[PDB]
Amino acid sequence: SMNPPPPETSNPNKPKRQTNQLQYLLRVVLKTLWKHQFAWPFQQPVDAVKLNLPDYYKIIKTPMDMGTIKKRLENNYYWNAQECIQDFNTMFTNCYIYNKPGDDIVLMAEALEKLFLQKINELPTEE
């Protein structure tokens, strides 16, 4: 069962900004999670064909991954920090929705989420 196109990462007509909070989301939050030993399953859209998960995009209707987030941050795609924070939370939630408690993929997401929460706890006040 086929893969959908990836989430949008480019849109010239979308209003967008670089803010100090969005800079922190790239330089601290994304960079910290990306380098982690458990990042790799989350570094690109789920290939439900290669993984033989024909139900994946039937259950997960708002897919998100760090590859997409990375491109959005590098392209300054976002208007505000909350939009990016929502993408991270969608990614984590999607993992917990699709999978079973205690599964390896869930343990991996939980480790990344713990770090995510620690970093966003120190999100700087907007300049």
Ligand X SMILES: Cc1cnc(Nc2ccc(C(=O)NC3CCN(C)CC3)c(F)c2)nc1Nc1ccc(Cl)c(NS(=O)(=O)C(C)(C)C)c1
Stretch that binds ligand X, among 24-32, 44-52, 66-74, 80-88 (CB under 6 A): 44-52
Residue in 98, 85, 11 with CA at minimum distance from that of residue 48: 98
Distance of closest approach, residue 66 Cβ to ligand X, in angstroms: 9
Q: Which is nearer to ligand X, 51 or 117 (CB)?
A: 51
With beta carbons less than 8 A apart as the criterion, state whether 111 and 33 touch: no
Q: Which is nearer to ligand X, 17 or 114 (CB)?
A: 114
Buried b (16+ CB within 10 A) or exposed e, 9-27: eeeeeeebeebebbebbbe
- Stretch (H or E) spanning 89: helix 81-98
**Apex 99 CA angle, 96 and 102, nearest 5:** 85
Interaction mask 61-100, ligand X, x per CB under 6 A = ----------------------------------x--xx-
Q: Of these, 36, 104, 114, 118, which contacts ligand X (CB under 6 A)? A: 104
Q: Of these, 16, 32, 39, 41, which contacts ligand X (CB under 6 A)? A: 41
CB atoms within 10 A of CB 84: 23
Residues that bind ligand X (CB under 6 A): 41-42, 46, 51-53, 95, 98-99, 104-105
